[PDB]
Amino acid sequence: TDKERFIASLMARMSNAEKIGQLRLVSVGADHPKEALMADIRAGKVGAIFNTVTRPDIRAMQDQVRHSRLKIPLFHAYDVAHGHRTIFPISLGLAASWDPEVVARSARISALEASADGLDMSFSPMVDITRDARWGRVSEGFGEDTYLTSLLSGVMVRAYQGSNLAAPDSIMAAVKHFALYGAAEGGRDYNTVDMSLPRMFQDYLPPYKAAVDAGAGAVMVSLNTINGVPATANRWLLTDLLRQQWGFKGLTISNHGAVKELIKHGLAGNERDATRLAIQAGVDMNMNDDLYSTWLPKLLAAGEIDQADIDRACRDVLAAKYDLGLFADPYRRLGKPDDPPFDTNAESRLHRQAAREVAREGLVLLKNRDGLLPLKKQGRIAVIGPLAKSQRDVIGSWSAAGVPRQAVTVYQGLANAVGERATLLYAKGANVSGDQAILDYLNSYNPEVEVDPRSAEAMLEEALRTARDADLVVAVVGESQGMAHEASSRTDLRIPASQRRLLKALKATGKPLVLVLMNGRPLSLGWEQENADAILETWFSGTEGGNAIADVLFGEHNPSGKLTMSFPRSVGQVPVYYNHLNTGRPMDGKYTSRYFDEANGPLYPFGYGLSYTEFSLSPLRLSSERLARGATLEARVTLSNSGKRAGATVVQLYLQDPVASLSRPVKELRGFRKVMLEPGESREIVFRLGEADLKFYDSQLRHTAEPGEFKVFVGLDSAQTESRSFTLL
């Protein structure tokens, strides 16, 4: 009522010109030069800013608000995806921690730094489910699993927003991309999404819903068609589902140029009609293309739009500014005037300890033949590969205000660890790619890839001479961050050919070979799994990446990360995911659902990851054989560290509904516990399962649990499990 009073009196004052100006979301660019933008803010024609990210710059913009009749403050947004200035691992690496508190910590520090620079909103978290490793943006999400992505979706929102959206160290979450953006056909960015409603409700929508139920202040709408209707023009998605069914009360934001793109989708013949479709579907705020400002007045005057369409959009912008505390104090995130100036990028405003501890948790040990890892800080260590000394790659895609020169490379991380106790020998070995067309693509906007002008053969000969002079080879190989970016979809999932040629030459020297992988998507690693002695998955591990990688390689931290996305044997197996249907003819002979020209199944399954120690699970026990409606059941198992080193693992609870009105998955994740144990230590793990855990969407979207058998599986990954059954009454 108090908020409603302030907001209703303010909107009673406003002209349509002022209401429509609140819907304009812009950035300083060629589209909107700084001084023209300043004039537009003075004239009341701007609602919010993105990509202006420092206190002085945001202050100068907020200072123009004084010259408007109503003095409605701006909010300031940015893409703080996995860090603002202190860069954490990419989301796919954070997910691999299997630890909500580690992810929450990355989010809280991101919000602290962003809010310290004056930012009120992040276009995050990205909660799109990804089953297609070809898509460039899988790096930005939490992998293939609905339960895990849904849990981390809520965690990110609560950690960004705190208990109070007005707090100077809180930012608003704009959850993206609503919806289904990750299921693009062919894994080609922006491409067609087509799926049944039961799959959509069961597998793809719950993460957006968790963000809404966690109190997300905003929702960013996606660029893709859903079943033939672009999200930006999809009333069924933005009004019926998001508002009426889920009760979302916040702000909807279109993606960059999305209203105008309704023309190229063939939903609209002109910008006037595109604008009508977007506002009536339920898009409040319009990013960069300015069609709302250009066309809403004419649409309203012609009776094509209703006043209520303008009023609803405007109300959502004002309610967001109110909740962010910006009517109370527009400078609340910008300090007091006469606070002394600072270097935005000062070393003292970073959080290196938080970045290092988080980065350690996401590293996944994929292979370790004969205890080669951990390494001893001694002897001669060859560090070879195009990513060994790469500052720009270790902070990954969507590195926000991250500064490459402030990042710790793998080489530098190893140098910091050994000091004088061991000798590092360096050789680039190869360029990230040997294909000139792929280098032209990676270098097309900014210099992202250091191209060594020497021949491939000369770099190899140097690498082989370096390996020969060492006790063992740490090969730092994989993708540059520009390969797992928006619009950077891949037809091949292997390590690039220039680097595989290097690895083959390194193998033939007979030296022990440790692979340190940098990559923003699942890679095809058949040759590496056969021929490398050890493999460490490091994703893009952030500002402190190299230090956290050295901490695991030398045994300071025992690798605890587990995969949250299945690793295909090749691109021709796509899609592969752990929660698939059985079919009528599952492969364990010939007449089964399989390929004939390659081994079947993923190379590494969902939830896979090794340790320097060994863990054991006692038999799974259920607290009863039968479960009454309204009752809870307990699944009990004892986890023991039966090896020589302290270490964490992740105990995973899976569920199967083997008889149902729909064909249900062979298994679905329904719980986990990350557990840190000393040698010989045990922990009794108790999972609680109720009827809520057993429901699914039928063909008419009835969300019900049916009577009958459920199988419960517990294990340290999605493959290596045992099951016990109970009956729901």
Ligand X SMILES: OC[C@H]1O[C@@H](O[C@@H]2[C@@H](O)[C@H](O[C@@H]3[C@@H](O)[C@H](O)O[C@H](CO)[C@H]3O)O[C@H](CO)[C@H]2O)[C@H](O)[C@@H](O)[C@@H]1O
Ligand Y SMILES: OC[C@H]1O[C@@H](O[C@@H]2[C@@H](O)[C@H](O)O[C@H](CO)[C@H]2O)[C@H](O)[C@@H](O)[C@@H]1O
Judged by CB under 8 A, the number of residues near a second copy is: 83
Query: Residues marked as binding for Mg(2+)?
Result: 657, 659
Considering only residues 642 through 701, tell me which ones interact with ligand X, judged by CB under 6 A: none
Q: How far apart (Å, rounded) are the C-alpha atoms in residues 193 and 201?
A: 14
123 binds, among a second copy, Mg ion, ligand Y, none (CB under 5 to 8 A by kind): ligand Y
* 606 near ligand Y (CB under 6 A): no
Instruction: Tally Cβ neighbours within 10 Å of residue 642.
Output: 14
Choose which of 57, 63, 450, 486 interacts with ligand Y (CB under 6 A): 486
Give the integer Cα–Cα distance in Å for 634 and 627. Answer: 10
Count residues near ligand X (CB under 6 A): 10
* Structure token pair of residue 697: 């969407």
Q: At 268, which amino acid appears? A: A
- Cβ closest to ligand Y, residue 150 vs residue 255: 255
**Under rule CB under 6 A, residue 596 binds ligand X:** no
Number of residues forming the site for ligand Y (CB under 6 A)? 10
Q: Which of 363, 396, 368 is nearest to 97 (CA)?
A: 363
Q: Read off the tokens for 493.
A: 């999932």
267, interface contact from ligand Y, ligand X, a second copy, none, CB < 5-8 Å by kind: a second copy
Which residue, 186 or 708, has its beta carbon nearer to Mg ion? 708
572: nearest Cα among 494, 474, 499 = 494
Q: Which does 265 bind (CB under 5 to 8 A by kind): a second copy, Mg ion, ligand X, none?
A: a second copy
Length of the chain: 729
Report if residue 192 touches a second copy, rule: CB under 8 A: yes
Q: What is the 3-state secondary structure (H, E, C) of 362-404?
A: HCEEEEEHHHCCCCCCCCEEEEECCCCCCHHHHCCCCCCCCCH
Pick from 225, 255, 293, 573 the residue near ligand Y by CB under 6 A: 255
- Kindly state whether residue 256 participates in binding ligand X, applying the rule CB under 6 A: yes
Beta carbons of 598 and 569 less than 8 angstroms apart = yes
Q: How far is the CB of 223 from ligand X (least distance, A)?
A: 7
Binding mask 398-437 for a second copy (x = CB under 8 A): -------------------------------------x--
Q: How far apart are CA 502 and CA 135, in angstroms?
A: 26
Q: Are 251 and 215 in contact (CB under 8 A)?
A: no
Which residue lies nearer to Mg ion by CB, 646 or 660?
660
Q: Report the C-alpha gap between 585 and 247 in whole angstroms.
A: 42
Could you give the 3-state DSSP secondary structure of residue 47? coil
Contact between 596 and ligand Y per CB under 6 A: no
Q: Which is nearer to a second copy, 580 or 673 (CB)?
A: 580
**Binding of a second copy by 591 (CB under 8 A):** yes
Q: Could you give the CA distance from residue 21 to residue 17 in angstroms, rounded to a whole number? A: 6
Contact with ligand X (CB under 6 A) among 486, 614, 691, 698: 486
Q: Is residue 707 close enough to count as binding a second copy by CB under 8 A?
A: no
Nearer residue to ligand X within complex by CB, 108 or 485? 485
Question: Footprint of ligand Y on residues 117-146 (CB under 6 A)?
Answer: 123
**What DSSP line would sit under 61-77, residue for residue?**
HHHHGGGSSS-PPPEEE
Helix 2-13, helix 307-323: angle, nearest 10: 130
Nearest distance from residue 156's CB to ligand Y, in Å? 14
Residues 6+ apart with CB under 8 A from 241: 205
3-class secondary-structure state, position 529 = helix
Pick from Mg ion, ligand X, a second copy, none: which does 706 bind, CB < 5 to 8 A by kind?
Mg ion
Task: Give yes or no for a cis peptide into 125 (omega within 30° of 0).
Answer: yes
User: Is residue 708 close enough to count as binding a second copy by CB under 8 A?
Assistant: yes
Query: Is residue 1 at the binding interface for a second copy, with CB under 8 A as the rule?
Result: no
Phi, psi of 106 (to 5 degrees): -60, -45
Return all residues near 540 (Cβ < 8 A) that are at least 6 apart.
Answer: 89, 90, 93, 139, 393, 394, 395, 396, 397, 481, 518, 519, 520
Among 162, 168, 215, 257, binds ligand X (CB under 6 A): 257
| Interaction residues for a second copy, span 445-464 (CB under 8 A) | 445
Indicate whether 239 belongs to the interface with a second copy (CB under 8 A): no
Residue 491 found at the interface with a second copy (CB under 8 A): yes
Helix (H) or strand (E) holding 553: helix 545-553
Shortest Cβ distance from residue 586 to ligand Y (Å)?
13
Applying the rule CB under 6 A, the residues between 18 and 77 that interact with ligand Y are: 50
By CB under 6 A, the residues from 541 to 570 that bind ligand X are none
Q: Does 657 bind Mg ion (CB under 5 A)?
A: yes
Residue 505 touches which member of Mg ion, a second copy, ligand X, none, C-beta under 5-8 Å by kind: none
Among 29, 56, 658, 707, binds a second copy (CB under 8 A): 658
Closest by alpha carbon to 21, among 58, 59, 73? 73
Question: Is the Cα torsion angle 136, 210, 53, 538 positive or negative in sign?
Answer: negative
C-beta of 448 vs 717, nearer to a second copy:
448
Q: Is 123 in the site for ligand X (CB under 6 A)?
A: yes
Cβ-closest residue to Mg ion? 708
Residues followed by a break in the chain, C–N over 2.5 Å?
A: 588
Q: Tell me which stretch binds ligand X (CB under 6 A): 61-69, 238-246, 255-263, 558-566.
A: 255-263
Contacting ligand X within 195-224 (CB under 6 A): 220
Q: How far apart are CA 320 and CA 324, in angstroms?
A: 6
**How many CA within 13 A on the CB side of residue 704?**
11
Task: Using CB under 8 A, pick the residue from 353, 616, 632, 663 that binds a second copy.
Answer: 663
- The region of 147-155, 276-284, 521-529, 704-712 touching Mg ion under the rule CB under 5 A is 704-712
Give the pairing type, strands 647-656 and 708-715. antiparallel
For ligand X, the closer CB: 218 or 475: 218
User: Which residues contact Mg ion by CB under 5 A?
Assistant: 657, 659-660, 706, 708
Binding site for ligand X (CB under 6 A): 50, 79, 123, 176, 220, 255-257, 486, 591
Q: Which residues bind ligand Y (CB under 6 A)?
A: 50, 79, 123, 176, 220, 255-257, 486, 591
